[PDB]
């Protein structure tokens, strides 16, 4: 129905918004762009699904989430990749650690704080009835 599109539409607004005000902290530039294959050669062979905040805006605009837990999910993934491609004791990785689950936190804090439970329980019946 046009009701359920535009529950939709609403949850790809509030997707956008939540992960605008991630793209610009500046603890969370590095989550913001595909890792450059020039740049970091072995990224690929280590990372299988690279996940980045451009990437999730991308899958917003395509209609890919039709729920939160759908975003969290990519979210979680953006924070394990970082984890999993910097685990070294080295001030290096453990600040991107750091800030991978700096990013998780956030999202999850905003979502917690601005996401109705009911918005996200019609998204999920919407969801399973397709
Ligand atoms: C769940 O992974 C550990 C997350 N974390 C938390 C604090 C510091 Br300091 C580094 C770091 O990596
Ligand atoms: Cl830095």
Same mark, same amino acid.
């Given at each position: 129905?046009?009701?359920?599109?535009?529950?939709?539409?609403?949850?790809?607004?509030?997707?956008?918004?939540?992960?605008?005000?991630?793209?610009?902290?500046? *603890?969370? *530039?590095?989550?913001?762009?595909?890792?450059?294959?020039?740049?970091?050669?072995?990224?690929?062979?280590?990372?299988?699904?690279?996940?980045?905040?451009?990437?999730?805006?991308?899958?917003?605009?395509?209609?890919?989430?039709?729920?939160?837990?759908?975003?969290?999910?990519?979210?979680?993934?953006? @924070?394990?990749?970082?984890?999993?491609?910097?685990?070294?004791?080295?001030?290096?990785?453990?600040?991107?650690?750091? *800030?991978? @689950?700096?990013?998780?936190?956030?999202?999850?804090?905003?979502?917690?704080?601005?996401?109705?439970?009911?918005?996200?329980?019609?998204?999920?019946?919407?969801?399973?009835?397709?």
């Amino acid at each position: 129905s046009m009701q359920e599109e535009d529950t939709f539409r609403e949850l790809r607004i509030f997707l956008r918004n939540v992960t605008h005000r991630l793209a610009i902290d500046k *603890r969370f *530039r590095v989550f913001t762009k595909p890792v450059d294959p020039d740049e970091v050669p072995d990224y690929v062979t280590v990372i299988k699904q690279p996940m980045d905040l451009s990437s999730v805006i991308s899958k917003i605009d395509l209609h890919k989430y039709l729920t939160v837990k759908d975003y969290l999910r990519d979210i979680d993934l953006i @924070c394990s990749n970082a984890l999993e491609y910097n685990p070294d004791r080295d001030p290096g990785d453990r600040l991107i650690r750091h *800030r991978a @689950c700096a990013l998780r936190d956030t999202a999850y804090a905003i979502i917690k704080e601005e996401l109705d439970e009911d918005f996200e329980q019609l998204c999920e019946e919407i969801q399973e009835s397709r």
